[PDB]
Design a protein around this ligand. Structure first.
Ligand SMILES: Cc1oc(=O)oc1CSc1ncnc2[nH]cnc12
Length: 167
C-alpha cells in the first residue's frame, strides 16, 4: 500500500491521473519524482521549469554543480539528484526532444531508467514541449517499465484521450 490517490489503473504496474506533477509531489512526497530533463539540466520550461520553480531554483543550483563536475547527460540517460521539497529524490530523465531531431527510439532507453526504482511519480517522457506523440509515449511506458509508475498528465483533454485510446 502507498499514498497515491485517484489514479486509474492501466496495467499491473502503470497508473494514470489528470494532475499537476508539482502539486502531486508536494502532497505525496514520493520517494522518486521524475523530471523531464534535458542533457544540460537546464530547467527552463515544461515539467522541468515547473518543478524547478517549485524548489525556489534550488534544483537548478544543484543541477549546475552536477554538470560542472560530470558534464552533460546522454539522451536516453538519467541521474539521481535531490528531490528538495517535492520528493526524497528526483530522477532526471532525458527523453528525446523531437523539436531537436532526436531519435524517437531513444524513448525506450529513457523509460528503462525507471526500472531502477521500485515506485515513481512521473510525467510522460518526450511529451509536451519535447514534441513526441503522448499516446506513443504511454505505449512505450507500458511496454518498458516493470516497476510501479504513477503518471501525472497535466492537461485534462489529453488525459481523457490517453485513457479512451488505451489498448
Ligand atoms: C511540458 C513538459 O515539459 C517536460 O519537461 O515534461 C513535460 C510533460 S507534460 C507536463 N507539463 C507540465 N506539468 C506537468 N505535470 C504533468 N505533466 C506535465
Amino acid at each position: 500500500v502507498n499514498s497515491f490517490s485517484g489514479y486509474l489503473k492501466l496495467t499491473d504496474n502503470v497508473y494514470i491521473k489528470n494532475a499537476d506533477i508539482v502539486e502531486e509531489a508536494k502532497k505525496v512526497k514520493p520517494t522518486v519524482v521524475v523530471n523531464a530533463a534535458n542533457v544540460y539540466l537546464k530547467h527552463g520550461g515544461g515539467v522541468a521549469g515547473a518543478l524547478n520553480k517549485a524548489t525556489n531554483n534550488a534544483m537548478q543550483v544543484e543541477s549546475d554543480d552536477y554538470i560542472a563536475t560530470n558534464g552533460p547527460l546522454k539522451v536516453g540517460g538519467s541521474c539521481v539528484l535531490s528531490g528538495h521539497n517535492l520528493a526524497k529524490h528526483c530522477l532526471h530523465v532525458v527523453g528525446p526532444n523531437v523539436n531537436k531531431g532526436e531519435d524517437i527510439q531513444l524513448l525506450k532507453s529513457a523509460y528503462e531508467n525507471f526500472n531502477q526504482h521500485e515506485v515513481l511519480l512521473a510525467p510522460l517522457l518526450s511529451a509536451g514541449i519535447f514534441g513526441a506523440d503522448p499516446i506513443h509515449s504511454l505505449r512505450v511506458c507500458v511496454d518498458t517499465v516493470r516497476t510501479n509508475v504513477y503518471l501525472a498528465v497535466f492537461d485534462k483533454n489529453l488525459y481523457d484521450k490517453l485513457v479512451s485510446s488505451f489498448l
